[PDB]
Amino acid sequence: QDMSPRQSAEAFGVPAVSSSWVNQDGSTMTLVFGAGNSVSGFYVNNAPGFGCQGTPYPLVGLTWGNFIGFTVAWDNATANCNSVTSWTGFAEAAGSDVTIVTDWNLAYQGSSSGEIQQGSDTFTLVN
């Protein structure tokens, strides 16, 4: 009874195993549903006031039904920001549209030691 990649994507609300998304600040990501409830893809940060802008970072997560969680560690061949974000949220479908409402936490280096900042991102499915 392992959910197929296509069954996992359809339970999320999208017709295809891969799907591309944009948030309110214009960051983009692509999500790929796999076996074992897996989520893979990449994330492109375009939000102002943050580093590691404009290049893809690996993303990994899990999904069940219309719920999802995924993490991005901010290191790639181009730039490092010494930080990690996780998003968690839920998809809503309407007509031909899909939205993911998420909250996120971002661990980063504090003064003395680590801190966790928070926020919210809403992603829309790029048709």
Place this chain on the structure above:
Amino acid sequence: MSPRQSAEAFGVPAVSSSWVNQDGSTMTLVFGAGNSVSGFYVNNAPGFGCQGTPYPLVGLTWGNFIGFTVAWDNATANCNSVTSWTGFAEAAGSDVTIVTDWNLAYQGSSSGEIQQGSDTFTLVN
């Protein structure tokens, strides 16, 4: 890039380690290649579903920072929900602590909802 070096940079001198949070929930973390973490999580927190049965976790680390997710589906119980934790490790002598915040996305009273909280994990060994 090596699993042991990734584990050591997190603060733990083993690729496989076992942790417990303030509410008795447990997890095993396995550091793999390229920042990967994999393992299992057992929820023993009062006031939640899906208690006492292991769920897969996946995530990533950089240095002493970590993020990971658990989908609340397995052969024993399904809670139709997902949690992600994000936070940082701190190492005091032989003890190591992970300070995290989490979000649990679930089917709420009448629509999806996201509940927030904080877990601190200590190394069991």
